[PDB]
Design a protein around this nucleic acid. Structure first.
Lengths: 273, 273, 273, 273
DNA sequence: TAGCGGAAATTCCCGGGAATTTCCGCT
DNA sequence: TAGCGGAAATTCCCGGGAATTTCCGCT
């Protein structure tokens, strides 16, 4: 039998809370999970449907997957990992009680110690190679399931990894979102100053991406146009049709060239001169 | 000798009062307990009809029937449980004094201790499993009859559980019902704002469920769209066919993902653009 | 010399926090104090401008002004009252560190004891008459100033009382505020159903008040149109002009006939049939 | 003999560095200093010009000048205070090595103890009043000069206080400055949306202040209009005359009601409808 | 040099909104 | 009477946004 992540965790959005912060109920939202309803990381067990055990731990993002320092607070959680009995009912299993607790650099060494001192190494990585530098800005979920063979003897399935979950605090991995704009319409020739407010962004890695029917332009602005990483004053690019008859509505949104990530689309109609 | 439940306790309809509400507290009614006539939880002992004693305690409604924190107040009750000597000349015994006194979360920890300290564990469940989260909104009656073996010495019979009993106090148990709506018709494309008023609901656990001929959509709204748990402003979802000729009437209703419960259906016709 | 309250405290808005709640920095906002900038209770001293002392305490709302049970937490506060040296600079004195801490009924008797046991009776009321039933839903600020005569001898001025301050708990005295509306425009003839959501209100004492250029109408709705005190479905009244040429924007807001109180105004434009 | 402050320290500008921050030592400049001519806090002793010693400590900016928790780092400093022997052949003494090292809230309690343990109390304020709340964003320099009486024995002179010194990095006391604006002109009737970007500001304590010939209005915006404390979207207020013939240029700037501080003025011309 | 100043890396705190207790009408 | 039920009066809690510490560029 093998494990399958039918419901991946939301890669962006939530921010790793610290131990000091009076938080713990925090739960990793499902990939789908919308503002209306939130889904939760779910895995399916193909080839089995009886009693068993499931352990969830955190690992590095890069190929060398070592026990990540951050802990995993929540229900059935201890020493940084999740571990509860598997429900014999069906092969479907979802988790809504998974909270990520990022540790401080001071307690970085101590964190990694408990990992192996508690034997929380899912990929059995050499203690020599695991040591180095960790990216406390992103993590991965490691589903370690253990079922039973036809006879009833423990059967440890092959560990599976989920898509990386970044922390919503770093302007580079954080989620892009436009909050407000001074105007949502301009000449088809462009050149109209736009004051849009958004979330923390990298002025050396961000851009106003315009899209439409097989078309795509970009906002004009130098790094000096990004105010405190939350505001961008740019100029509207000229529309494909430098002389349209009627107004045309296109989609505007923030883009991050690094990981070619996009923000939520925003309606923007072009007006003829 | 075995114990048989003749009259199960009424499932729901009665909330779990606090110690402070004793002044206006009640007793557990019978299953088939009408209002004109009153019946109470009754059991039957077959294979013995002489001297003996009965112990009634409260356990969880889940598989691991652990000692429930709530207490069982009433005549012949003590330390959260009931216990007395049953008629040595009757095989059927009814109980019309049993009362459920829910404990406060603050005194919940000690409550479990008292359950163990007095050996109120009828299923001999390891204390290791008696520290997790308990469902303070449901309970099961555990009848522990002790007769006298064919010789004359005490003979504890196999414990018998009753049906789950839930109190109306529980927030997520309230019945779903739509009271009023601003409009009952909209474009087949959806997107029409709907102001519906209903009863107390969980903004983190509720949704506008649309149904029809092998079809089902959902209303669009964030938690911030639920006003004081009695009003929900949402957008109508796009019907199956995004371009119907004539109007189509579907069923709309509130749904609670937790227990997949539904409210009373409401007629809603879709209109072509 | 006499004391003058040039800056009364906001009668409604803030809610008395309990001792358990991790709050204390709470400060009574000035009567003016808007969302932008907040003013603070200020008093002017006419006939004096040198060194002195000022004590602020809480008293009953009704004529029999007795030491109110609630305490006054904040800077220079002890035993439930405020007392700091008066600043010789000028005759103006404002307080932004005044926080109200409401006590529980259990500690009601104990609260009143400390009042007189600490001799915090500003109006010297007979211990016999002060005892009775207290109102924990409203209080008054008692400014007890003590200056110096031309010679330099202590001069206790006449205590002054500030307007009542009710807790935003009870609707009749709570603050009125419209949260959301299905539409903000209708025919000049009126009759358009309006679904507005607001805060707790008295269905027997509330009304949708329309205002404009020397004009004022009212929403139409029976008590049965008020859903759980937070929603009101009413009909728009016919605007003064029964046939205007262009749209006219008027102000809409909730009104409470009891104390003729109003909520925040809301823009509403009338449209010709 | 008395001490006189010749050169007061600059109030704004410099910010309090913590123990961790080393590189930027810091040196309190004189209020009458410039880039071309750096001046520093200077005092003058009149009535003596021989041997002696000077002690400089930090006290609160409020009436009860208690020993401030912050330390005074720099040359000839120790235990939060400065102290050295001044030139026995000069009546004027300047200090260009004084630095303010703010302490952390965690070590704030002990800091006060150190102040007392070393008798760093120049105003002999009872330790009873040295436990309340502290404003660690403002401080006053307390010059404690000790000369030699006409005889030759030590003679402590009356302590002299300086003007306050505010922490530039302190949010509530930082410098106000408008960086960019979407438009600098609008109708004399007002109501034009303005997107202005500035530095860190308190959304609960900030306002767009308009001024002119014996006139002054204010921008309209709720706290929800302040984006990440660096952007404010407000509406232009109506000018003194709602129907002017020609354009009128007034001054616009940020204002902070707390300390009624202002930002650099900005030209803004009003245009007739 | 000595710093300034922007930005991450920790910690805190408040406005609400609810759930949790308690109290009291009303058959 | 016996209980429903509803409101109160208390207590919790979440989302944020901030603040506070610390870091490091850069000249």
């Amino acid at each position: 039998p093998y494990v399958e992540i039918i419901e991946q965790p939301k890669q962006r959005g939530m921010r790793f809370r610290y131990k000091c912060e009076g938080r713990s109920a925090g739960s990793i939202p499902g990939e789908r999970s919308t503002d209306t309803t939130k889904t939760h990381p779910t895995i399916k067990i193909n080839g089995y449907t009886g009693p068993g055990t499931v352990r969830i731990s955190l690992v590095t993002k890069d190929p060398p997957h070592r026990p990540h320092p951050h802990e995993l607070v929540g229900k059935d959680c201890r020493d940084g990992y999740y571990e509860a009995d598997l429900c014999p009912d069906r092969s479907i299993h979802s988790f809504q009680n998974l909270g990520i607790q990022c540790v401080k650099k001071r307690d970085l060494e101590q964190a990694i110690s408990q990992r192996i001192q508690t034997n929380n190494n899912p990929f059995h990585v050499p203690i020599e190679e695991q040591r180095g530098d960790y990216d406390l800005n992103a993590v991965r979920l490691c589903f370690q399931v253990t079922v039973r063979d036809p006879a009833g003897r423990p059967l440890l399935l092959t560990p599976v990894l989920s898509h990386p979950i970044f922390d919503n605090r770093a302007p580079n991995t954080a989620e892009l979102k436009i909050c407000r704009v001074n105007r949502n319409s301009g000449s088809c020739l462009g050149g109209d100053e736009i004051f849009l407010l958004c979330d923390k962004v990298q002025k050396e890695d961000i851009e106003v991406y315009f899209t439409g029917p097989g078309w795509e332009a970009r906002g004009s602005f130098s790094q000096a146009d990004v105010h405190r990483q939350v505001a961008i004053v740019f100029r509207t690019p000229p529309y494909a049709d430098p002389s349209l008859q009627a107004p045309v509505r296109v989609s505007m949104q923030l883009r991050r060239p690094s990981d070619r990530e996009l923000s939520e689309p925003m309606e923007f109609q072009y007006l003829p001169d």
